Enzyme design. Structure first.
Site, PDB file in Angstrom:
ATOM      1  N   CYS A 162       0.938  -1.104   0.000  1.00  0.00           N
ATOM      2  CA  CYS A 162       0.000   0.000   0.000  1.00  0.00           C
ATOM      3  C   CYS A 162       0.982   1.156   0.000  1.00  0.00           C
ATOM      4  CB  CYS A 162      -0.890   0.000   1.253  1.00  0.00           C
ATOM      5  SG  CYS A 162      -0.137  -0.632   2.774  1.00  0.00           S
ATOM      6  N   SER A 197      -1.999  -3.610   3.771  1.00  0.00           N
ATOM      7  CA  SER A 197      -1.314  -4.838   3.406  1.00  0.00           C
ATOM      8  C   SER A 197      -1.501  -5.882   4.494  1.00  0.00           C
ATOM      9  CB  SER A 197       0.174  -4.569   3.205  1.00  0.00           C
ATOM     10  OG  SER A 197       0.380  -3.644   2.152  1.00  0.00           O
ATOM     11  N   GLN A 211      -2.492  -0.802  11.220  1.00  0.00           N
ATOM     12  CA  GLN A 211      -2.049   0.451  11.829  1.00  0.00           C
ATOM     13  C   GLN A 211      -2.988   1.080  12.843  1.00  0.00           C
ATOM     14  OE1 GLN A 211       1.103   2.577  11.139  1.00  0.00           O
ATOM     15  NE2 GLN A 211       1.475   0.361  11.151  1.00  0.00           N
TER      16      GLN A 211
END
Ligand SMILES: O=C(CC(=O)c1cccc(OCc2ccccc2)c1)C(=O)N1CCN(C(=O)C(=O)CC(=O)c2cccc(OCc3ccccc3)c2)CC1
EC number: 3.1.3.48
Length: 282
Positions: A214, A221, A261
């Site tokens: 990405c 990802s 994230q």
């Protein structure tokens, strides 16, 4: 199952807490080579480096460095190479990797431009007659066909090793609808996209590991690989409800940092696996 856990965490609204434990427990390994001065211009993000033990090595002297990690999922018998979106100066390295690792597919989970900024170099030819040549790694890339759908685009590329004149067909799966902010409302599109990559054989053991990226090659990802592996696992073992997303994620984080994230990404991952399990095994 996990849907109960999902509705539970949702009820108490503790996703952020759930996510924090993972980050806290997440593995920590050295990224020495990624930190060498000579590799400064080969990294996109200072806070996104590949561990030395699982990093992909370019088969060339001088510098074998590329910000990419080999994520090997033993039980699921599936491997993925997560990498950063190529930089203006690492496009040759990127394709050299695809070549040396014998990858059949490239999964892109970002647009070249998002939020008004370039999140990745234009590493593939956009027109059949305008091939791309990577002089440093001596490779030629040609766009063979392109199928544009509403949520993603699939391209057939021909990669040629100018050194041996050998050529290989690479499938490029480009998910183009991940929102600039947050995660998708429903995992429907993402799952279909994953199933498409699967049906292509790009994830199959007869080929080298699929290359996923990405912008940083960790958030989106990570979500892609986590979902795929969890679904495989639920399909392989005795009791599907034994699959622990958190456990799998921790296992993957042993190979590359940052996977998933945000807490929102984690919730979405649960959502994708849950919904995907319903489609796969009713
Ligand atoms: O997006 C962000 C937000 C972020 O957390 C961040 C990280 C460090 C410093 C920072 O200032 C403060 C700030 C706060 C609010 C508004 C403006 C500025 C903000 C960003 O401001 N940037 C992206 C790349 N970058 C970095 O410093 C990184 O290097 C961040 C990183 O790790 C990363 C990069 C790409 C993707 C990714 O994960 C997938 C994803 C997809 C969609 C939505 C959310 C997450 C994680 C510089 C610009």
């Amino acid at each position: 199952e996990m849907e109960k856990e999902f509705e539970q965490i949702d009820k108490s609204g503790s996703w952020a807490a759930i996510y924090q434990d993972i980050r806290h427990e997440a593995s920590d390994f050295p990224c020495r080579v990624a930190k060498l001065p000579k590799n400064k211009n080969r990294n996109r993000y200072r806070d996104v480096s590949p561990f030395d033990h699982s990093r992909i090595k370019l088969h060339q002297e001088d510098n074998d460095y590329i910000n990419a990690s080999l994520i090997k999922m033993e039980e699921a018998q599936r491997s993925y190479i997560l990498t950063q979106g190529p930089l203006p100066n690492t496009c040759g390295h990127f394709w050299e990797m695809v070549w040396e690792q014998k990858s059949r597919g490239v999964v892109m989970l970002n647009r070249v431009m998002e939020k008004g900024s370039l999140k990745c170099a234009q590493y593939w030819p956009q027109k059949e007659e305008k091939e791309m040549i990577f002089e440093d790694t001596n490779l030629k890339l040609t766009l063979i066909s392109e199928d544009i759908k509403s949520y993603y685009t699939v391209r057939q590329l021909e990669l040629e090793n100018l050194t041996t004149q050998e050529t290989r067909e690479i499938l490029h799966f480009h998910y183009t609808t991940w929102p600039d902010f947050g995660v998708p409302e429903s995992p429907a599109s993402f799952l279909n996209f994953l199933f498409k990559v699967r049906e292509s054989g790009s994830l199959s053991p007869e080929h080298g590991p699929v290359v996923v990226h990405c912008s940083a090659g960790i958030g989106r990802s990570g979500t892609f690989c986590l979902a795929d592996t969890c679904l495989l696992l639920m399909d392989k073992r005795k009791d599907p409800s034994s699959v622990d997303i958190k456990k799998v994620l921790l296992e993957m984080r042993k190979f590359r940092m940052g996977l998933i994230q945000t807490a929102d990404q984690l919730r979405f991952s649960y959502l994708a696996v849950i919904e995907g399990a319903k489609f796969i095994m009713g």
